[PDB]
Structure formats: C-alpha cells, structure tokens
Amino acid sequence: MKSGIYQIKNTLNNKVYVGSAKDFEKAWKRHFKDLEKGCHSSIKLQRSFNKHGNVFECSILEEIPYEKDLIIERENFWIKELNSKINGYNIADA
Amino acid sequence: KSGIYQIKNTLNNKVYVGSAKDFEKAWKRHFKDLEKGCHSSIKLQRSFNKHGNVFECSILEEIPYEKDLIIERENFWIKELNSKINGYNIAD
C-alpha cells in the first residue's frame, strides 16, 4: 500500500527523520517543498538541509493502513528503534 | 466542525480562503505557521508581518469534508471574495 511509516535519511551521516503518511509520494513532496522554502516542521531537518543541501533519500520503513492507533504505535516504534529523536531529526513522539 | 473558512484582515477586509476537517485545529496550525514566518501563503505571511494582530478567523460554510465538494465550494468562495487577485490566496 501507499500508507505507513517512512524515513528521510541523510546519506552523509545516516541520521533519519521518521514520519507517517496516507500517501508516501504526496508526503515526501510536501516535506521537500517545505525544506526548499526553509519551513520544514523539524528545524533539525531544516538546518541539516540548509547546511548539506539535498543529500536525503526517502524510503518506506513499513507499509500499514493509515489507522490512527496503529500509526502512532509503529511511528513511535521506528523512532525509538532508529533513535531518530536523540540522534535523528525528529523533535517529538508521534 | 468542517467546511470553508476565511482568515480576514479586519483593516481592509482582504481574506485568505481555506478548508478544514476541523476549523479550530486548522486555525491553530495556520497562526502557528504565521508566528514562525512559515505560512504557505507568502501574501498572508507578509500581511501578517506588516499589520500584526488584526486578523479574524470565521466560518464561511459548514459542510462535511468531501474532497470534490470542498474543492468546489473552496473555489466558489475564492471567486466570491476575489481572494486571489485582491486577497491572500495564491494566484493561478
């Protein structure tokens, strides 16, 4: 499916931003449109983008139905497993 | 709680027309973006930076959030309020 949890990874240091979406492609386009404008929801990801340019790759981590409870659970799951909060670009829990 | 709304500049009545599944929620996100200088509408962002605390949010039409219907009514109000040429909505 086109829904589930994904990651935006900095190919230079492997740090990631974990997110969830109903449509991966549409979500990724939105996130990069914001980055290009300097307005991504994560100031950590934005500053990384500002500094390194576009060294990021988007990819699906887990395809799952966009179900509120399941999404929050798996989104926080991946954040913890990839340590994307402390050593990533996430700024909070799902 | 869903439908078409407007963010109006009470100084000149110019508006930004938008749609939402949850009015209060949408307005909250739009103003946080304005405070951060990150509203998707640069025209609204500039107006906000220039005039400050003069904007008022209100519902134009309450209707269930059905993509097509929303789009149609969204366009109806944009044209009715001339919000693209003399407003804060993005021009085609």
UniProtKB/Swiss-Prot annotation, chain A:
Disulfide bond annotation, renumbered to this chain: none
Occurrences of domain GIY-YIG (ranges): 1-88
Record's signal peptide: none
Family to which this protein belongs: To endonucleases of group I introns of fungi and phage.
Function (record text): This endonuclease is specific to the thymidylate synthase (td) gene splice junction and is involved in intron homing.
Identification of the protein by name: Intron-associated endonuclease 1
